[PDB]
mmCIF file of C-alpha atoms in Angstrom:
data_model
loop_
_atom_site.group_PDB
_atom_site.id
_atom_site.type_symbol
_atom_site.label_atom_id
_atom_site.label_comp_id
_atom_site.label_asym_id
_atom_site.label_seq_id
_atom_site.Cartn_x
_atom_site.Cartn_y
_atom_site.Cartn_z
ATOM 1 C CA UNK A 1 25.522 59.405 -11.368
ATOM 2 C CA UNK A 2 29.004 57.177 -11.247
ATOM 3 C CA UNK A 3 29.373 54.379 -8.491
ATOM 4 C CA UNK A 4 32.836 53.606 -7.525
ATOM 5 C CA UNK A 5 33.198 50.008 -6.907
ATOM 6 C CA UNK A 6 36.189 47.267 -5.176
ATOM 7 C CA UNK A 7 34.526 44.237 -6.850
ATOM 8 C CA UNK A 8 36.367 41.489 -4.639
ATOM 9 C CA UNK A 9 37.047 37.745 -4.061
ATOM 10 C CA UNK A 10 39.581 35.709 -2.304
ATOM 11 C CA UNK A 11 43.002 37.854 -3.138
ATOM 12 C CA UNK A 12 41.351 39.372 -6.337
ATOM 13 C CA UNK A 13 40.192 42.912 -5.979
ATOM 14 C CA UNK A 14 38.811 44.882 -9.172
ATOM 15 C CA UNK A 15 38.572 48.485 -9.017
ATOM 16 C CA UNK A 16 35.773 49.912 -11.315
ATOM 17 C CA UNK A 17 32.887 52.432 -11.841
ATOM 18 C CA UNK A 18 28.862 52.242 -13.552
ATOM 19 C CA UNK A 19 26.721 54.533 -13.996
ATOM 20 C CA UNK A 20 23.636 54.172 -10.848
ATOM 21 C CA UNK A 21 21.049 53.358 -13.418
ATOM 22 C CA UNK A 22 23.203 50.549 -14.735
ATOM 23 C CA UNK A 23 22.368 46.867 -13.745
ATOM 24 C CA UNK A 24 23.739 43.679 -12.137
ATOM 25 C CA UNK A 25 24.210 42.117 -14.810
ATOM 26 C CA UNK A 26 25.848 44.570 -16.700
ATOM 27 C CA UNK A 27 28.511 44.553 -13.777
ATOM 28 C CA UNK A 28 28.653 40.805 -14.163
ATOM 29 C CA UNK A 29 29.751 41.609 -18.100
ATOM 30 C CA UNK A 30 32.201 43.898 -17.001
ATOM 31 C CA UNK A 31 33.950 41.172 -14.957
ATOM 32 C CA UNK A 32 33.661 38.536 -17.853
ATOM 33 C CA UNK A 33 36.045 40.897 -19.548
ATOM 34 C CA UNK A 34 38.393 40.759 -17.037
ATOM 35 C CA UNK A 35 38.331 37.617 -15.308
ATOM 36 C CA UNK A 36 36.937 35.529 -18.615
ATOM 37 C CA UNK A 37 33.461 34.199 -16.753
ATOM 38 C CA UNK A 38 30.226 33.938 -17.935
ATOM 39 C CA UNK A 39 27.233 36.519 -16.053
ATOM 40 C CA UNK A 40 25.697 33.045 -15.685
ATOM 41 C CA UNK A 41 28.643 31.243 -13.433
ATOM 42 C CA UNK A 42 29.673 34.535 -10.963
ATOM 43 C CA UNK A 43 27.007 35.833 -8.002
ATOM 44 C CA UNK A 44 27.604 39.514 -6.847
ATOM 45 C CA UNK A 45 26.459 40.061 -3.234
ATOM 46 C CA UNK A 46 26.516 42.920 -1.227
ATOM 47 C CA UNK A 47 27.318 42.001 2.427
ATOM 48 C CA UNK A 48 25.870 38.256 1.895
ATOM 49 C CA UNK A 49 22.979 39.607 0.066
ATOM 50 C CA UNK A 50 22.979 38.108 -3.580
ATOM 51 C CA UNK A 51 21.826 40.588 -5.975
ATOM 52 C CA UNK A 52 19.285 40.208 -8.990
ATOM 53 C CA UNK A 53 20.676 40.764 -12.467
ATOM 54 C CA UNK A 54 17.568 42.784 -13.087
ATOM 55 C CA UNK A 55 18.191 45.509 -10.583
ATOM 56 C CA UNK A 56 20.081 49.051 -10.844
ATOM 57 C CA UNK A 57 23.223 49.553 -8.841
ATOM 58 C CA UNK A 58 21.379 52.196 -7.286
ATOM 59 C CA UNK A 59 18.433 50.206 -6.365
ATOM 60 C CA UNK A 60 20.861 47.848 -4.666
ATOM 61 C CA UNK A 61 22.067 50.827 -2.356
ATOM 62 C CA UNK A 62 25.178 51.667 -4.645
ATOM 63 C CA UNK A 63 24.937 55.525 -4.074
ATOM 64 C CA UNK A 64 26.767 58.153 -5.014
ATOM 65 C CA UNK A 65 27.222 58.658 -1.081
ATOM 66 C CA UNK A 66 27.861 55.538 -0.826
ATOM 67 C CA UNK A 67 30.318 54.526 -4.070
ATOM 68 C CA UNK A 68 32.795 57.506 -3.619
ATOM 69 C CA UNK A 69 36.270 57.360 -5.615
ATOM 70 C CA UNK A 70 37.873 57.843 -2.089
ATOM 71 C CA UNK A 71 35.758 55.194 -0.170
ATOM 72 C CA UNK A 72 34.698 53.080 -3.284
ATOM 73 C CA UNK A 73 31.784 50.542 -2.009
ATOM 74 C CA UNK A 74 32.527 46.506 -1.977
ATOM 75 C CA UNK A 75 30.860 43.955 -4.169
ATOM 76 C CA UNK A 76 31.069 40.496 -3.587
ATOM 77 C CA UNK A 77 31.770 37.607 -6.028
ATOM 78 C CA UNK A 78 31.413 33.726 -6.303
ATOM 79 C CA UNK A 79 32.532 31.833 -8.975
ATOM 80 C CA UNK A 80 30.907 28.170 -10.380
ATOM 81 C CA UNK A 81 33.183 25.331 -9.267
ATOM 82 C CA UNK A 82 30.563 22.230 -10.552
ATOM 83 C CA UNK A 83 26.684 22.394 -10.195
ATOM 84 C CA UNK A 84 27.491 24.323 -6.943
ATOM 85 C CA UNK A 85 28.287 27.972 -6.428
ATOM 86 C CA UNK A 86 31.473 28.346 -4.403
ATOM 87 C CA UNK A 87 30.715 30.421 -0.730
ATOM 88 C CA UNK A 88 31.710 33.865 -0.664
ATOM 89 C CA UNK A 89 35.148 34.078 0.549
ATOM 90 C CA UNK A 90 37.070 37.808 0.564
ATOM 91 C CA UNK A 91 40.907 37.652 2.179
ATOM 92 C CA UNK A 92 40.974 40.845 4.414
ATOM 93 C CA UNK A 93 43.421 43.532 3.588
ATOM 94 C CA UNK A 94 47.085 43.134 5.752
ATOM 95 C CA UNK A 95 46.586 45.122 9.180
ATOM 96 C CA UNK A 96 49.222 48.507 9.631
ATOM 97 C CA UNK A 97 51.969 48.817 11.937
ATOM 98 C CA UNK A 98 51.564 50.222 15.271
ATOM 99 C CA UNK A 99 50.903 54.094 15.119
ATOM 100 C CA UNK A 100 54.740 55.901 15.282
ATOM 101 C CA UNK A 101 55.136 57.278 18.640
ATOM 102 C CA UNK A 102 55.409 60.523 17.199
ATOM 103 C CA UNK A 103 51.865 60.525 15.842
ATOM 104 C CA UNK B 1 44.509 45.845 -22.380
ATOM 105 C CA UNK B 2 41.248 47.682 -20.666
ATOM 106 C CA UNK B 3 42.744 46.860 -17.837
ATOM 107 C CA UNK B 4 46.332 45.762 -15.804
ATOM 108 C CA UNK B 5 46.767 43.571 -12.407
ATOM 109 C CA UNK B 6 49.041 45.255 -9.728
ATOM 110 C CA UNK B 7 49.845 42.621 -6.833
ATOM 111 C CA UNK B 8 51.070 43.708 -3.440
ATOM 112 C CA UNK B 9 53.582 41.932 -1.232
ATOM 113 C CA UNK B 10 51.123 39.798 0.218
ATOM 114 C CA UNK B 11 49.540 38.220 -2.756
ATOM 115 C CA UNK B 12 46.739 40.765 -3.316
ATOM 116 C CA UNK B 13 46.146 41.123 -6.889
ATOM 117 C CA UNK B 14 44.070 44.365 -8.129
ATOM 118 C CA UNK B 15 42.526 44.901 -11.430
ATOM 119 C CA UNK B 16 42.273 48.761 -12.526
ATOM 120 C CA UNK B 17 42.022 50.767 -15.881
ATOM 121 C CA UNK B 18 45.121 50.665 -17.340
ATOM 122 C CA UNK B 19 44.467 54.727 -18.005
ATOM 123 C CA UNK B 20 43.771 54.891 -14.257
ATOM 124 C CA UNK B 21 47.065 53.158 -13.898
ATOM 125 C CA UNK B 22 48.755 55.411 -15.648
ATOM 126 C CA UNK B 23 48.554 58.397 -13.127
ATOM 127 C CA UNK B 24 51.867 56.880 -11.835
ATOM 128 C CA UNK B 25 54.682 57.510 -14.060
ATOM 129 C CA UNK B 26 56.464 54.575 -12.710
ATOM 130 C CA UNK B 27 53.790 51.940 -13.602
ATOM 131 C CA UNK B 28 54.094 54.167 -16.856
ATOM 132 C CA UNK B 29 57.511 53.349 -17.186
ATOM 133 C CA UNK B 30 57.104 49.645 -15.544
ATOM 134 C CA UNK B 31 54.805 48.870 -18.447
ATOM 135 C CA UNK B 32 56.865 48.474 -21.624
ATOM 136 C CA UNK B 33 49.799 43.590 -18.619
ATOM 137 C CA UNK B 34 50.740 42.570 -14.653
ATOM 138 C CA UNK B 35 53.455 44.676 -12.292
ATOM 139 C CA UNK B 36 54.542 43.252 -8.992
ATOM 140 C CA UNK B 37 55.285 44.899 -6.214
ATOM 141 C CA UNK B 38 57.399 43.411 -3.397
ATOM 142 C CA UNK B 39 57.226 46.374 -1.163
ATOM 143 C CA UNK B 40 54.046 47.546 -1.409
ATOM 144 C CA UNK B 41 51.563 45.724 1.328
ATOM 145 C CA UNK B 42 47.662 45.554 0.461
ATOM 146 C CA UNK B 43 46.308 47.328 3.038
ATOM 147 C CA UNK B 44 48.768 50.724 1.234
ATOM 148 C CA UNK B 45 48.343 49.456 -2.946
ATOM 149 C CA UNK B 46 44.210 49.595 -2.013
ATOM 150 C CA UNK B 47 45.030 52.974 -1.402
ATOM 151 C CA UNK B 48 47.270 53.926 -4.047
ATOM 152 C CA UNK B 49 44.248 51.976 -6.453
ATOM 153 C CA UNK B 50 41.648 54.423 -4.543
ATOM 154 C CA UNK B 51 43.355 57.548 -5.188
ATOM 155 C CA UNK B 52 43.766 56.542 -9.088
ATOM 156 C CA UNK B 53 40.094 56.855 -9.490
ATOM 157 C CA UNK B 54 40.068 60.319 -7.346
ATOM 158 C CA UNK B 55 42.357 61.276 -9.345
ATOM 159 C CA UNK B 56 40.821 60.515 -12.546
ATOM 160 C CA UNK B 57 37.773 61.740 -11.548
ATOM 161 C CA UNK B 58 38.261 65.249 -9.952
ATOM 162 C CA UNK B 59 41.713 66.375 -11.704
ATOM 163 C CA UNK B 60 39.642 68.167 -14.512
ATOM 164 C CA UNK B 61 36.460 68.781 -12.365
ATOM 165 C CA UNK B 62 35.475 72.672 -12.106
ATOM 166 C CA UNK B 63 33.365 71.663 -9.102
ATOM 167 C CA UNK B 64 34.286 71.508 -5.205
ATOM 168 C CA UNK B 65 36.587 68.295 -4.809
ATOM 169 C CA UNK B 66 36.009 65.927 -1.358
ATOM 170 C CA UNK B 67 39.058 65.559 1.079
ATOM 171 C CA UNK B 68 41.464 62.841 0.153
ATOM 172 C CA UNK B 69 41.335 60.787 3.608
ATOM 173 C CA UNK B 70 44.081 58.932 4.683
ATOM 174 C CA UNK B 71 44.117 57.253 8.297
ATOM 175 C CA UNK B 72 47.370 58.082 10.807
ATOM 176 C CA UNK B 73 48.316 54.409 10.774
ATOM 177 C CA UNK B 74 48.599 53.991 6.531
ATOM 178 C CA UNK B 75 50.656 57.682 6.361
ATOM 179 C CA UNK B 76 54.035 56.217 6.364
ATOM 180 C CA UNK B 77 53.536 53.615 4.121
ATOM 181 C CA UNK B 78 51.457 55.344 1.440
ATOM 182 C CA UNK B 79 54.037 58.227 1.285
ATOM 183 C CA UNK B 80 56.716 55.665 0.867
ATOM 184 C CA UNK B 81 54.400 54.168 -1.464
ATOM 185 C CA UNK B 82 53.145 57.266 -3.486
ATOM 186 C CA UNK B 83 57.299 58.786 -3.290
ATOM 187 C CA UNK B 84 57.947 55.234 -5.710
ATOM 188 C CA UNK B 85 55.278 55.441 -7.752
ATOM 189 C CA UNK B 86 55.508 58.747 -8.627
ATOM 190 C CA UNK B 87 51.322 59.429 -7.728
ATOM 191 C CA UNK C 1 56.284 94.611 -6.508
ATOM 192 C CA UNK C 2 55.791 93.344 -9.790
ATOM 193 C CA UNK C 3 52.878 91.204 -8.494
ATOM 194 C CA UNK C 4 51.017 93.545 -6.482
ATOM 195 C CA UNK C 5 47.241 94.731 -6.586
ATOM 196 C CA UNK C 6 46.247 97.854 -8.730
ATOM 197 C CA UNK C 7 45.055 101.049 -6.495
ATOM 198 C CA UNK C 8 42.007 101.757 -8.782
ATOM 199 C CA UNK C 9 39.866 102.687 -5.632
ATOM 200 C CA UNK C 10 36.858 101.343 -7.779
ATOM 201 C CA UNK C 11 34.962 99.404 -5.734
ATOM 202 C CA UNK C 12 34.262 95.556 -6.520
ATOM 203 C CA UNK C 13 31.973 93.564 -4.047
ATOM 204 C CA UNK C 14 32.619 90.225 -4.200
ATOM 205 C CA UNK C 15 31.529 86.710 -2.589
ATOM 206 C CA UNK C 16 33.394 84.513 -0.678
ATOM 207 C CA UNK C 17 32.374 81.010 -0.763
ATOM 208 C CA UNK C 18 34.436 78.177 0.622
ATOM 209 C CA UNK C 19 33.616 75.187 -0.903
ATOM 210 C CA UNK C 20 36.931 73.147 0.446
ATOM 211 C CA UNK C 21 36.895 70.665 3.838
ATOM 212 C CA UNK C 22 39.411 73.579 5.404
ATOM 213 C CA UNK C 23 39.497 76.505 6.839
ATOM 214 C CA UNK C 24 40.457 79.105 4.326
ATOM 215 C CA UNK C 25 42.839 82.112 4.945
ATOM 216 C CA UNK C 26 42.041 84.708 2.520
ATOM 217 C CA UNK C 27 45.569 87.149 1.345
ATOM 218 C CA UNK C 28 45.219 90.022 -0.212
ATOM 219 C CA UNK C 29 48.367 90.798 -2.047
ATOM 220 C CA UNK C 30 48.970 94.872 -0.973
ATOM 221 C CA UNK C 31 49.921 97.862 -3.252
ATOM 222 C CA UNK C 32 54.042 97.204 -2.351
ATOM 223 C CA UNK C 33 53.375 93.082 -3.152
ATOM 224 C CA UNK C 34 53.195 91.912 0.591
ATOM 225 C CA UNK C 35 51.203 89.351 1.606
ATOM 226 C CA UNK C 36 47.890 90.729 3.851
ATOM 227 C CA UNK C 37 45.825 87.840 5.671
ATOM 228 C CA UNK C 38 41.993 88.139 5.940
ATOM 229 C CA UNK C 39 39.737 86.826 8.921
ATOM 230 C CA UNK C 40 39.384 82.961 7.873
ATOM 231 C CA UNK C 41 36.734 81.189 6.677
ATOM 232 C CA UNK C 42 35.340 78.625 8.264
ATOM 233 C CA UNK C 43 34.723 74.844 6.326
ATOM 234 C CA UNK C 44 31.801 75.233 4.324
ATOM 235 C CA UNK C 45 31.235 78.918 4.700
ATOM 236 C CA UNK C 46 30.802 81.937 2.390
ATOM 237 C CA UNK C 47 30.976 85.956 2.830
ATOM 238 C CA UNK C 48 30.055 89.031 0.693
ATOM 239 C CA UNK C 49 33.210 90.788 1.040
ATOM 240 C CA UNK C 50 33.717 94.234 -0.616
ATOM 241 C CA UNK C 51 37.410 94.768 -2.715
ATOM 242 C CA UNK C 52 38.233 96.687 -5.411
ATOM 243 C CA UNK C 53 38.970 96.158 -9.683
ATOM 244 C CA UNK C 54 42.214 95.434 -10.393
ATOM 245 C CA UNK C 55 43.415 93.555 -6.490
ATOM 246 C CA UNK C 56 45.010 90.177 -5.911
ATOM 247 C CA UNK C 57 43.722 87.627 -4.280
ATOM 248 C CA UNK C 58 45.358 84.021 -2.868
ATOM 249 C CA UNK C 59 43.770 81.266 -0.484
ATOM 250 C CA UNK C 60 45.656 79.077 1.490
ATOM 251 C CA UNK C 61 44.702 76.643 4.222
ATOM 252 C CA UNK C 62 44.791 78.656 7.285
ATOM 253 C CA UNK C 63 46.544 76.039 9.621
ATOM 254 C CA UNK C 64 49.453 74.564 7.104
ATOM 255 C CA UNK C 65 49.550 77.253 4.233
ATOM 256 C CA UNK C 66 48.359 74.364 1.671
ATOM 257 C CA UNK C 67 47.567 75.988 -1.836
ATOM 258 C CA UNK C 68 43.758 76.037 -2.689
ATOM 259 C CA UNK C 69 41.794 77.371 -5.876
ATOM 260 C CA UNK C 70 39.925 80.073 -6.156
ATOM 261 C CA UNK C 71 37.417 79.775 -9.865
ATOM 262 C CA UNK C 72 40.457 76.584 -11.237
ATOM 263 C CA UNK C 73 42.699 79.735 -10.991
ATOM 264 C CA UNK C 74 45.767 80.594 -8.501
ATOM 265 C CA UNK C 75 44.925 83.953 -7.981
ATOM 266 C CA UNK C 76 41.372 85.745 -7.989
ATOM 267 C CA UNK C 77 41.164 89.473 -9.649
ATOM 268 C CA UNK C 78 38.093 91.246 -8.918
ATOM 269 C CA UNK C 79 36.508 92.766 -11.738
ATOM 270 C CA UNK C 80 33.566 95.442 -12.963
ATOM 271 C CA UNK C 81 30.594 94.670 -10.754
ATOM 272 C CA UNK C 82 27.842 94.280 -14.550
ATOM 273 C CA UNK C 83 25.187 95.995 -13.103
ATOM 274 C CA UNK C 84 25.541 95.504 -9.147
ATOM 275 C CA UNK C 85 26.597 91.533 -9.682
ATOM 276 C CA UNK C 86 28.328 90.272 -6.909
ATOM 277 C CA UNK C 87 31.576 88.275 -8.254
ATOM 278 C CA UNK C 88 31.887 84.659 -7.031
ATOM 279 C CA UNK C 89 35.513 83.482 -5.877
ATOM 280 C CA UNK C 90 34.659 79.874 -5.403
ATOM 281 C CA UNK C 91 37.755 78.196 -3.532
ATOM 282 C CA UNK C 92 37.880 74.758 -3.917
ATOM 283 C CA UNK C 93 40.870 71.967 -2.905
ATOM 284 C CA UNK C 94 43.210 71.253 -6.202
ATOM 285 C CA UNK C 95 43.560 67.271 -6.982
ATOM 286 C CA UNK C 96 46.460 66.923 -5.042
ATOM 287 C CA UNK C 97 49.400 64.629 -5.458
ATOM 288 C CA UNK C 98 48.962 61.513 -3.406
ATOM 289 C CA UNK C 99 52.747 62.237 -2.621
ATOM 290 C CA UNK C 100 51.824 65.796 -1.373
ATOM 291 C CA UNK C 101 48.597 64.164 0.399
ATOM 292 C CA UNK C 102 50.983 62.006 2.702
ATOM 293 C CA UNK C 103 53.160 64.771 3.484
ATOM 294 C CA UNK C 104 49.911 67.317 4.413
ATOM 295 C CA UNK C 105 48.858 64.183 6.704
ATOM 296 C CA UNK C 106 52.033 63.200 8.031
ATOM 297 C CA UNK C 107 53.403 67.195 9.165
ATOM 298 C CA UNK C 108 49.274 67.116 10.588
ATOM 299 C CA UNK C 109 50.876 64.829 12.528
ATOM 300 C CA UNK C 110 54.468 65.075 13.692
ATOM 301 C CA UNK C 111 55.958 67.620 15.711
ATOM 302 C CA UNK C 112 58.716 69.543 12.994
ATOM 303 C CA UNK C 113 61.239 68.282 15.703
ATOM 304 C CA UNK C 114 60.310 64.710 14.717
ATOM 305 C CA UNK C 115 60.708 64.420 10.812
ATOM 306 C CA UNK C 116 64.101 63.066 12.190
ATOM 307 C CA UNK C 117 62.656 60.697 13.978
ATOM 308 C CA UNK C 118 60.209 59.149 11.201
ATOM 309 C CA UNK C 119 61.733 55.960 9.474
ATOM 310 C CA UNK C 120 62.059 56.939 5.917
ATOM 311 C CA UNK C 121 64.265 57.794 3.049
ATOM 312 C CA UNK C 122 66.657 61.179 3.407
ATOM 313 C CA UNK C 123 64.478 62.457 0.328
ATOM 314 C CA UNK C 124 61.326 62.610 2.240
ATOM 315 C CA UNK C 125 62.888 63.845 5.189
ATOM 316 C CA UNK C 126 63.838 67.188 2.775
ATOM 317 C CA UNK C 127 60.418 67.440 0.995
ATOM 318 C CA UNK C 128 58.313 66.917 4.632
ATOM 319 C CA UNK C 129 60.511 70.422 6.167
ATOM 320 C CA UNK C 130 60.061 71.934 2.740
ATOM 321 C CA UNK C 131 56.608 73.285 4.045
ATOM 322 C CA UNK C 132 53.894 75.152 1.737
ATOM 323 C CA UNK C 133 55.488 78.887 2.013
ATOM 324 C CA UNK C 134 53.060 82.156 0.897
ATOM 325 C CA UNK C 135 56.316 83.662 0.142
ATOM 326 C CA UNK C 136 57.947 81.086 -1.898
ATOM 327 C CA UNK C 137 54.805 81.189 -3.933
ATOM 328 C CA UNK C 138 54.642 84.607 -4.236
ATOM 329 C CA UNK C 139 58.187 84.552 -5.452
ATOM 330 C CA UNK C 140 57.150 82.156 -8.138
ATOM 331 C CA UNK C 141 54.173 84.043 -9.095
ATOM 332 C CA UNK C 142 56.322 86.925 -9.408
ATOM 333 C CA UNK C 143 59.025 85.329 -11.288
ATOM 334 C CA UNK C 144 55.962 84.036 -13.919
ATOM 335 C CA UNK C 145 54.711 87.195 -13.946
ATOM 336 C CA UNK C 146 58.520 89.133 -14.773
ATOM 337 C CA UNK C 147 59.126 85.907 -17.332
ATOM 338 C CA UNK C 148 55.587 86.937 -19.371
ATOM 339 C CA UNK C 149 56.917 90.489 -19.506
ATOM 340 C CA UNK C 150 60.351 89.704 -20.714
ATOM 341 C CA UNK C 151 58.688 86.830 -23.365
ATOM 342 C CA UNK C 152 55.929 87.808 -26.364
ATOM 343 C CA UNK C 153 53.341 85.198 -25.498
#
C-alpha cells in the first residue's frame, strides 16, 4: 500500500512515502510543506514524463515493487522561474572509489 | 519540524522525517533543523537516508523483512558512515 | 546446561518455513546444552520437520552464523500439537543495524587475513573479527536464562 519515494531536483533530494491510492497532487502538497511552493508552480515527472495531478501514484507506476524502502523510486521536480517552467535538471549522486583489492 | 535537511560533502542536501532521522543517535544528539556533514559523500548519506525508512518500516513488522542491499563499492564508506552515526 | 532442551519424548511436528533471503541452518540445542546443526534450508524454502514439546530451537545463517528470527522470538519451543496442528516456526531476517549490515557485507567480502588490510578506524577492525559466534550466543542466552532464575521477574 506505501510507496517509498527520492523526490529530487538539482542537489535537493526529499525522502518520503504515500499511500498508492494517493494522488499527484497530493505529493505536490507534501513538497509545499517542505520546500514552501505552491502545487501550481512545481511539475513532478517520472523519467521526463510529467504527471497529471489527477492520477494515483500507483496509476503512474509507483508500485509497491517498484517504491521499496531499500530501492525507493525517483520523482522528478521543476520549479516556476517566470511564465516558464524551469527544465528538469537532477545532479547525479558522487561516483565510489575503485573496488579495494581485497574485494 | 516534520522534517530536517542532512547535506553531504558534496553539496547534496536531503530532506527526511525528522522521526526517520532519529534512528541515528548522533543526529539525535547533533540536533539540540539542518546537520552538515563534511565526511559523508552523497552517493553513502543516500544510503544512510534509504536505510532510515527500512528501518522505520520493518523494525516492528511481524512479517518476512527484504535483504538490506548494499553494493561492494559503497561497503567501506557506509560502515564508516553508519560506525558515526550510530545507525 | 542450564539452556538445554527438555527430554519429554512427546512428539511435536512442526513446520519449517524460511521466509529470509538466506540459507538457514537450523540448531537444535541437545539434552547437555550443545549446539546440534540441522540440514539447511534453502532461500525461500519450508519443511515439516518432526521434534518434540519442551526442545530448543536457534536459526542462524548457514554461511556467516548471522542471527535470524524464528515467530519475532530468539529461540523456537515446540509445543502441544491442538489436535494434530502442525506448529509454524516462521524465520525471518531481524531489522538489522546498518552498522552490522556493513560488517555482514564487508567479511562477505574480505578474506579474515585482510581486515588488516582495509583502510579504516582500529574500532572497526575489532568489531569486523568479532564474528557472529553460536557459542557466544548461547553463552548469553544462558547467562539470561541463570539471571531470570536468580531475579523474581
Amino acid at each position: 500500500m506505501d510507496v517509498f519515494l527520492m523526490i529530487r531536483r538539482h542537489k535537493t533530494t526529499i525522502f518520503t512515502d504515500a499511500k498508492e491510492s494517493s494522488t499527484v497532487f497530493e505529493l505536490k502538497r507534501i513538497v509545499e510543506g517542505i520546500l514552501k511552493r505552491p502545487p501550481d508552480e512545481q511539475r513532478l515527472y517520472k523519467d521526463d514524463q510529467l504527471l497529471d495531478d489527477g492520477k494515483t501514484l500507483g496509476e503512474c507506476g509507483f508500485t509497491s515493487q517498484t517504491a521499496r524502502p531499500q530501492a525507493p523510486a525517483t520523482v522528478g521536480l521543476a520549479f516556476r522561474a517566470d511564465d516558464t517552467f524551469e527544465a528538469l535538471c537532477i545532479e547525479p549522486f558522487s561516483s565510489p572509489p575503485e573496488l579495494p583489492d581485497v574485494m | 519540524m516534520m522534517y530536517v535537511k542532512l547535506i553531504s560533502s558534496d553539496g547534496h542536501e536531503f530532506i527526511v522525517k525528522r522521526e526517520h532521522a532519529l534512528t541515528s543517535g548522533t543526529i539525535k544528539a547533533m540536533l539540540s533543523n539542518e546537520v552538515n556533514f563534511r565526511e559523508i559523500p552523497s552517493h553513502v548519506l543516500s544510503k544512510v537516508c534509504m536505510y532510515f525508512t527500512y528501518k522505520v518500516r520493518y523494525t516492528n513488522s511481524s512479517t518476512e523483512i527484504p535483504e538490506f542491499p548494499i553494493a561492494p563499492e559503497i561497503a567501506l564508506e557506509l560502515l564508516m558512515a553508519a560506525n558515526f552515526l550510530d545507525c | 546446561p542450564v539452556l538445554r532442551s527438555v527430554n519429554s519424548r512427546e512428539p511435536s511436528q512442526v513446520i519449517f518455513c524460511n521466509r529470509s533471503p538466506r540459507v538457514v541452518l537450523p540448531v537444535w540445542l541437545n539434552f547437555d546444552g550443545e549446539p546440534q546443526p540441522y540440514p539447511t534450508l534453502p532461500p525461500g524454502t519450508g519443511r515439516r520437520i518432526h521434534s518434540y514439546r519442551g526442545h530448543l530451537w536457534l536459526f542462524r545463517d548457514a554461511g556467516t552464523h548471522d542471527g535470524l528470527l524464528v515467530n519475532q522470538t530468539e529461540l523456537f519451543v515446540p509445543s502441544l500439537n491442538v489436535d494434530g496442528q502442525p506448529i509454524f516456526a516462521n524465520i525471518t531476517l531481524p531489522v538489522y543495524t546498518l552498522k552490522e549490515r556493513c560488517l555482514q557485507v564487508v567479511r562477505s567480502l574480505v578474506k579474515p587475513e585482510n581486515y588488516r588490510r582495509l583502510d579504516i578506524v582500529r574500532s572497526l577492525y575489532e568489531d569486523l573479527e568479532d564474528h557472529p559466534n553460536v557459542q557466544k550466543d548461547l553463552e548469553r542466552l544462558t547467562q539470561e536464562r541463570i539471571a531470570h532464575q536468580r531475579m523474581g521477574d
